[PDB]
Amino acid sequence: GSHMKSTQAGEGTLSEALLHLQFDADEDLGALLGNSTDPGVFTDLASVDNSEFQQLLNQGVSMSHSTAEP
């Protein structure tokens, strides 16, 4: 976010954002969630509740966004 050419929508940006990052293979996040959870929070990824996260990620990297943070 330090520098940018233009703030405009595009194609293949999110698939590149996926293919060029690192995931939970060499190390993982299972330790911060604790030994016990609440199944009332459990659902399918295609059924997630995230409309407030939509506004956080609209501040930069995506296929189409309203702005780009410094």
Binding site: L18, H20, L21, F23, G34, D38, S62
Partner: protein, 100 residues
């Protein structure tokens, strides 16, 4: 006269949030093992790492009223139990993790 029951933009947000969450947890974890770390490819890491710092002390599911705490915990609880070999949202991350 009404909208559909499902939309692909929800799959794009959960994938853009999941790929950024899995990065932010590895970013948070590797910091204690390295003398220095480079600037991340995702700018939202700054805003999401503050949610992770709360979440190391939170596990109450839907009881927490914090916006990102419940949606992040919902992703991790799925990640810890899903048959990721055939789940359509887990599948692309499962494949992208291998750089060969």
């Amino acid at each position: 006269a009404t909208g559909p029951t499902a939309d692909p933009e929800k799959r794009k947000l959960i994938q853009q949030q999941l790929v950024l969450l899995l990065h932010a947890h590895k970013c948070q974890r590797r910091e204690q093992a390295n003398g220095e770390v480079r600037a991340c490819s995702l700018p939202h890491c700054r805003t999401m790492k503050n949610v992770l710092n709360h979440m190391t002390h939170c596990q109450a599911g839907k009881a927490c009223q914090v916006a990102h705490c419940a949606s992040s915990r919902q992703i991790i609880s799925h990640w810890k139990n899903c048959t990721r070999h055939d789940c359509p949202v887990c599948l692309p991350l499962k494949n992208a993790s291998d750089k060969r």
